[PDB]
RNA sequence: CCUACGCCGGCAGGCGCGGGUAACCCGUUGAACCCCAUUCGUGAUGGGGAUCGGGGAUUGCAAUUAUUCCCCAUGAACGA
């Protein structure tokens, strides 16, 4: 059968939000051995909704300048991070990943509508795919800026931030910026 | 590791406070006149394992290090790791360390001032010596 | 909100930021004919960490600084300033009695009045509230010089129109205007 | 046999290059 | 008694020579664990772990690899092993099990059996490469 | 300010490193390094000593990421 | 089933072939073993006190991987990334004299043979030895 | 209250740069109250949004 | 003049010895990142190597205002 990294299970994984249920593809036939797919997924529109979730966490992690082709460092960071979450929790860390992406994406968002000089924003609804991508970008960004100058390996930082956002801490930068956009959403309306 | 009980938290080798807890192959670099490659080729003939630190040592190791370090030809640090190959006076293949390092830099500058050469007046004025393209530089430290 | 402790520190500690803010503050003081060659009392509007306010102290001026950012003010605390720092939103008004200050200066700050994020009055209302109160808190014949970054010519015209309606006269000085990398707009005004 | 295989591989490579 | 096929990414060519054998898989004389980009081993192990090694029972599989880079060569070996098993069962065994294993591979990933449609293209004059061009100045 | 972590062991440092470490749910040289003011070199050599102590399982082992695990 | 050196983990084979050359003990060892880098394109000294031994082992194995490669090709294999200060990095090659005299020292053990073909290749003694130690590390692989 | 809601369409790209995609909205509370709202980012036909509230709607006329 | 190979050079380089007036000979054009182990452990530190002091070797009529390359020592600014 098919298990992540030779060992990790995918049939235990459950989606909570119906609003995000299709736009993460992890459960049945989008489980693969590695995040390294090396096929096109930005071919046309919405084809990066049917790419695997851990591939998205991988390909959004070479984001910074000096790392910008080095995907193998990224997949070992993913492997060490899943092992660290599997130690600190014990459960299947993919469930922690899904619960972290679900609990982190915004729900209302502010958009400047007017003219170039009328900054009179209007808090509108968040599209589900952009909620997915905004969540992945916040988790990677919290893994970045909390691992700039430390002793911690960036796999440890990603794993701990994924844990903290999976439970909705006041410690996750992702949950901090989600709460910030949700509070700005209260202001503009 | 272990807990070495003779641990001098301050080292004093050749008029220099050395942070003795630092790695031995990188705490000798801290003084002037010794870099990284040079202290390594010292330690390969100074017969101390790199695994240890700089505060884990015996003074017998310290005195044999300073012995090799002031006698660089007699202990097979041959004549290209040296700080000065052919001096103006004696031409002696010899290492020159911190106080003597500033002394011999000062010596060469005083000489080239006394020589009245193209270098010496640059060094008295404190400008670039190696013919640089200062059409956009010369920023920090000029007034 | 825009700044935090990390970013306020990185801005105030950057040598390139220090040099440019110092040059623009000294240029604003040269354009300020009312303090130029005179002692004066001053209000520094959008004072930040006090980089502009230190340079007011250099010419012997006594000053009050207004800023909306706590972290910019907290970084100013450790810089041995002689001015009074006040946590304040300039778009709600200038909270001094009539005729308090000889002059006012602002470096890199009033373009934020075109922004509609912080409060639920229109930028147009906040801009009027700023200029009308600013005219009042100034002495008669007092001066205001503001270096600012407009996004477009409509923002420049709106700022000019609001200052004009509040009773200010004067104009716009544009230094180095053929380089839109290095060009700087200075609003130079006087009260009645 | 090995030699033959190698030759075949080479040929394939050449073809690819041409393409 | 033998089938001779290939696999082709950007520059990587993977020559596959298979016949009736013993389950032997040589990649120029080395196994499928001895390739130093080793995490991609699992991608390199995708023809075996998806199909089961009992279907690779009595087949000699020789792999000779040319050109490319390491990741491109790994996907070329993956490509060539999958096409080699499919071509072997087509030429020497039924159509039905070949079609079945084709449907196992493609519905998992089409890139296993089909080629990649894109390469590092040539250059039309005016820049570093094809798309981005040189930079200028104003004022 | 200064992250000049302790380069060598101490009394109480080893009184926590021999003791508190097999009760963590996750034994990482960055974590052990981070909780008790220890350089990653020192904690890295100490965790290879904890291989030599035999208390603690070794799960992953790489260039710069070597994962240890408390037992049972 | 004559085992192949190519069918083993190569760097565990390098470490064991280094230990095998350590246990041998007979070789003309030069005197700049404790002085030099590998070439210009590195910065610091190597940490290995036996770096000559393991480089000789890896050089014998690279001779095993292809015959027809001279010292210049042995220079060219052991290349790397010279950092040119603030000017960008380039590829820079190995050191001629060191790799030449490693080949000379192992030539002393009748493990490196000069041919008619100009280069140097492995002796039949050498391939016998490498297949013996290959079976040693192969038993260290498929039976550990 | 939190309201999940079905997407029917994509009418246009309202805004100043083509940035608010226009979405007819069915509810998932089986009510036929089909309010047309504005979203930011890509939505295809048949998606499902999380409307924070149903009172504040997008602009008719 | 592109080089292979050998010898002598701790490192730049010399000396002998062929092919190549050219998909052939350099050439299978044997690269870098990458990877796997080691050491370092968040500070101006081994990051950054500038800024210089001694030499050494080539290019050439001619290197002084450092031609270039190499070997010690120097280690500023720089905290995104």
Swiss-Prot record, chain A:
Superkingdom per UniProt: Eukaryota
Modified residues (N6-acetyllysine): 32
Modified-residue entries (Phosphoserine), positions: 127
Keyword Iron-sulfur: no
Annotated SUPFAM superfamilies: Ribosomal protein S7
Keywords: Acetylation, Cytoplasm, Isopeptide bond, Nucleus, Phosphoprotein, Ribonucleoprotein, Ribosomal protein, Ubl conjugation
Chief subcellular location: cytoplasm
Gene3D superfamilies for this protein: Ribosomal protein S7 domain
Protein localization: Cytoplasm; Nucleus, Nucleolus
Cross-link entry Glycyl lysine isopeptide (Lys-Gly) (interchain with G-Cter in SUMO2), positions: 32
A biological process from GO: ribosomal small subunit assembly
Cellular-component GO terms for this entry: cytoplasm; cytosol; cytosolic ribosome; cytosolic small ribosomal subunit; extracellular exosome; focal adhesion; membrane; nucleolus
Gene Ontology molecular function: any one: mRNA binding
Assembly mode: Component of the small ribosomal subunit. Part of the small subunit (SSU) processome, composed of more than 70 proteins and the RNA chaperone small nucleolar RNA (snoRNA) U3.
NCBIfam families per record: PRK04027.1 (NF003106), uS7_euk_arch (TIGR01028)
Function recorded in the entry: Component of the small ribosomal subunit. The ribosome is a large ribonucleoprotein complex responsible for the synthesis of proteins in the cell. Part of the small subunit (SSU) processome, first precursor of the small eukaryotic ribosomal subunit. During the assembly of the SSU processome in the nucleolus, many ribosome biogenesis factors, an RNA chaperone and ribosomal proteins associate with the nascent pre-rRNA and work in concert to generate RNA folding, modifications, rearrangements and cleavage as well as targeted degradation of pre-ribosomal RNA by the RNA exosome.
Protein name (record): Small ribosomal subunit protein uS7
Gene behind this protein: RPS5
Curated annotation (Swiss-Prot), chain B:
InterPro entries per UniProt: Rbsml_uS13_C (IPR027437), Ribosomal_uS13 (IPR001892), Ribosomal_uS13-like_H2TH (IPR010979), Ribosomal_uS13_CS (IPR018269)
Signal sequence range: none
Residues with PTM N6-acetyllysine: 92, 104
Gene Ontology biological-process entries: cytoplasmic translation; translation
Keyword check for Ubl conjugation: yes
One GO location term (cellular component): membrane
Record bears the keyword RNA-binding: yes
Placement of covalent cross-link Glycyl lysine isopeptide (Lys-Gly) (interchain with G-Cter in SUMO2): 89, 92, 104
Primary localization: cytoplasm
Keywords from the UniProt entry: Acetylation, Cytoplasm, Isopeptide bond, Ribonucleoprotein, Ribosomal protein, RNA-binding, rRNA-binding, Ubl conjugation
Subcellular location: Cytoplasm
NCBIfam families: PRK04053.1
Function per UniProt: Component of the small ribosomal subunit. The ribosome is a large ribonucleoprotein complex responsible for the synthesis of proteins in the cell.
Protein name: Small ribosomal subunit protein uS13
Organism lineage: Eukaryota, Metazoa, Chordata, Craniata, Vertebrata
Gene designation: RPS18
Curated annotation (Swiss-Prot), chain C:
Keyword Secreted: no
EC number: 2.1.1.-
Post-translational modification: May be ubiquitinated and targeted to degradation in response to pro-inflammatory cytokine signaling.
Induction note: Up-regulated in CD8+ T lymphocytes by treatment with anti-CD3 and in B lymphocytes by treatment with CD40 ligand and anti-B cell receptor antibody. In macrophages, no induction following LPS treatment. Down-regulated by a combined treatment with TNF and IFNG (at protein level).
Claim: Transcription is one of the keywords in the record: yes
GO molecular function: methyltransferase activity; protein heterodimerization activity; RNA binding; rRNA (guanine) methyltransferase activity
Described purpose of this protein according to its UniProt entry: S-adenosyl-L-methionine-dependent methyltransferase that specifically methylates the N(7) position of a guanine in 18S rRNA. Requires the methyltransferase adapter protein TRM112 for full rRNA methyltransferase activity. Involved in the pre-rRNA processing steps leading to small-subunit rRNA production independently of its RNA-modifying catalytic activity. Important for biogenesis end export of the 40S ribosomal subunit independent on its methyltransferase activity. Locus-specific steroid receptor coactivator.
Family: Belongs to the class I-like SAM-binding methyltransferase superfamily. BUD23/WBSCR22 family.
The protein's name: 18S rRNA (guanine-N(7))-methyltransferase
Organism lineage string: Eukaryota, Metazoa, Chordata, Craniata, Vertebrata
Gene: BUD23
Residue span relative to the full protein: 16 to 207 of 281
Curated annotation (Swiss-Prot), chain F:
Any Gene Ontology biological process: ribosomal small subunit biogenesis
Residues bearing the modification N6-succinyllysine: 11, 53
Keywords: Acetylation, Cytoplasm, Ribonucleoprotein, Ribosomal protein
UniProt keyword Ribonucleoprotein, yes or no: yes
UniProt-recorded Gene Ontology molecular function terms: RNA binding; structural constituent of ribosome
Function: Component of the small ribosomal subunit. The ribosome is a large ribonucleoprotein complex responsible for the synthesis of proteins in the cell.
Assembly, per entry: Component of the small ribosomal subunit.
Protein name: Small ribosomal subunit protein eS25
Organism: Homo sapiens
